[PDB]
Amino acid sequence: SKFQQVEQDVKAIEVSLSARIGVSVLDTQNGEYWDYNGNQRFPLTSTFKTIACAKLLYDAEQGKVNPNSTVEIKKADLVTYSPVIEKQVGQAITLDDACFATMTTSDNTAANIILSAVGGPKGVTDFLRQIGDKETRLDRIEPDLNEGKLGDLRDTTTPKAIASTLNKFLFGSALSEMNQKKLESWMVNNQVTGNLLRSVLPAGWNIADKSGAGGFGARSITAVVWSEHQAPIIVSIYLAQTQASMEERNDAIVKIGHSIFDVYTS
Numbered sequence: 478s479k480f481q482q483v484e485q486d487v488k489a490i491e492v493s494l495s496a497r498i499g500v501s502v503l504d505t506q507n508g509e510y511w512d513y514n515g516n517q518r519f520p521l522t523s524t525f526k527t528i529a530c531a532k533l534l535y536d537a538e539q540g541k542v543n544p545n546s547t548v549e550i551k552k553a554d555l556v557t558y559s560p561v562i563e564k565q566v567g568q569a570i571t572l573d574d575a576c577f578a579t580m581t582t583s584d585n586t587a588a589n590i591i592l593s594a595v596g597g598p599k600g601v602t603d604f605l606r607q608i609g610d611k612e613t614r615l616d617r618i619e620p621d622l623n624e625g626k627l628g629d630l631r632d633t634t635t636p637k638a639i640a641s642t643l644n645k646f647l648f649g650s651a652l653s654e655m656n657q658k659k660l661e662s663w664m665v666n667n668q669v670t671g672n673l674l675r676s677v678l679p680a681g682w683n684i685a686d687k688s689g690a691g692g693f694g695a696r697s698i699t700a701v702v703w704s705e706h707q708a709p710i711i712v713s714i715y716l717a718q719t720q721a722s723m724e725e726r727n728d729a730i731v732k733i734g735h736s737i738f739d740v741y742t743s
Contacts, residue, residue, distance in 0.1 A: 480511040483736040487513045490729040496694065496719035498729070501636035502737055503644055506708035515637035518612075519715035520625040522689030523583050524639060524699045525601070525615050525632065530576040530663060531646045532595040532604045534656040544573040548590050556619050559586035580663035580687065585619035592618050598632075608645055612638035625692035627718050639699055640713035647685070647701060648709060661685050664701070672727050674700050674712070674734040679742045681705065694719035696726035698734075707741055 480502070491498050499514035537544045547569035550562055561578035562570070563586070570578075570587075572594050578587035595601060598615040605613045615622065616631035624632075647657055664685035678684055686700035697715040714730055721729075 479509075479740060480737075483511070483733065483740065484513055486732050486736045490716075490732065494716070494719045494721040494725060494729060496721065497717045499636040499713075499715050500733060501640040501711075501713040502740075503640050503711040504708075504741075505644065505648060505710065512637055516635050518630065518633045518635055519697065519717045520623065520689075520691050520695040521613070521615065521632050521634050521639070522623050522625070522691035522695050522697060523588075524634070524687055524689045524697050525613075525622070526579050526583065526588050526591075527643065527646070527660070527664065527687045527699065528605065528613070528615070529588060529591045529595060529601055530580055531652065531660055532601055533572055533576055533591055534652055534660060535604065536595055538653060538656065542572065542594055544576075545571050547571050548575065548594070550586075550590075554586055554589065556585045556589060559584045562586040562590075577663060581666050581668050583669055583689075589618050598622075605642065608642060608651055610634075610638050610642045613642060623689075623691035623695070625695040625717060627693070634715075636713040636715055640711045643699055643701065643713075644709075644711050661701075670698065673698050673730050674702070677731050677735045677738060678702065679704070679738050682707075682738075690723065690726075693717065694721055694726065696723070696730065698730055702738070710737075710741065712737055 499517045501512040501515045503510050536542045550565050552566045561584045575587040575590040578584040601615040613634040622632040670688045682704045684702045688698040695717050700712045703709045
């Protein structure tokens with residue numbers, strides 16, 4: 478009953494937005510976990526970016542690639558919504574800076590640059606299987622991976638799978654302490670999620686997050702929140718196949734986030 482209010486809020490949104498919605502909350506401080514449709518499939522959309530950049534750091538540690546190596550930006554590589562890369566045509570960008578761009582602004586060309594350096598969708602999926610994520614899969618690059626059609630298994634995850642994977646990336650030991658901090662900082666420095674969980678974050682708390690939006694109303698956020706008195710809590714919220722406006726989907730995330738935070742501030 479601890480998450481009773483959260484469950485009620487999710488059920489109300491499910492009805493009002495006639496949507497498929499799933500949530501997973503993992504509390505690393507006491508091993509507690511809760512979910513609603515946590516095993517259901519939803520489109521990753523931009524939430525996959527965190528995994529691709531985690532792989533860049535992991536591959537760098539193994540010596541498979543140099544994160545400081547540069548990649549030439551050609552006008553033909555540009556895809557929809559690439560604020561950082563669109564200003565660097567004809568120039569070279571380091572893989573590390575491409576990850577900074579895609580993690581903090583969600584720049585899509587930057588994400589494709591990272592994917593090309595870490596083995597594409599296939600390399601990313603293989604990496605996920607190695608860390609123990611049996612569900613999440615990446616199959617296409619930007620912009621096609623955002624299609625979000627019902628029943629399509631391509632580019633999907635479950636709320637529980639991605640929350641677990643983020644827990645492992647940031648707090649397990651697959652990545653070095655230095656790289657965990659680097660990945661976490663990229664998420665903390667996200668500039669495009671001010672209207673989601675950040676807008677209801679409790680005073681004194683911290684947050685590292687990455688959100689996404691896509692076809693058929695897909696909307697999501699994967700976040701890690703903590704404070705001086707609360708160890709990391711991983712929150713995964715996904716909506717799919719809804720006609721709801723972006724404002725209504727943001728409203729759903731803010732209401733659910735608020736209730737989740739109340740579980741831990743009350």
